[PDB]
Each structure stands twice: as structure tokens, then as C-alpha cells.
């Protein structure tokens, strides 16, 4: 990303803060949310196997 020299935070669509500008070496950093999601358990019937 290429932000203008005064810009500190980045924003995406629904006000999702998407980037920041590091104030100690002038890098724009893309933020990924820490990974999460549903867990599913796939089973034959317990009458068949555990």
C-alpha cells in the first residue's frame, strides 16, 4: 500500500482498520486478523465407529 505522508491508519469498507504506518521506520503494515473459525467433527454413527 502507498499512503500519503500524513496518514497514520488505513481503513477498508466497513471501517475495518486494515493497515498502520510504523512511526519508527516508515513502513505501511497490512493487518490480517488472527486466525479463527468454526470447528466441525465428521463422524460415522457411534453405532458404527468412535
Amino acid at each position: 500500500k502507498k499512503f500519503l505522508p500524513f496518514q497514520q491508519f488505513g481503513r477498508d469498507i466497513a471501517d475495518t482498520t486494515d493497515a498502520v504506518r510504523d512511526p519508527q521506520t516508515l513502513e505501511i503494515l497490512d493487518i490480517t486478523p488472527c486466525s479463527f473459525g468454526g470447528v466441525s467433527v465428521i463422524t460415522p454413527g457411534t453405532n458404527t465407529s468412535n
Binding site: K1, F3, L4, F6, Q7, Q8, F9, G10, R11, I28
Partner: peptide
């Protein structure tokens, strides 16, 4: 003018 120090792109911010 820019009412805040925030980067935004290809977006119609109200």
C-alpha cells in the same frame, strides 16, 4: 480537506 489522518481507497466515505 482530509478531516482525519486516515488512508482510504476507491471508496465513497461520507
Amino acid at each position: 480537506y482530509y478531516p482525519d489522518k486516515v488512508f482510504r481507497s476507491s471508496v465513497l466515505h461520507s
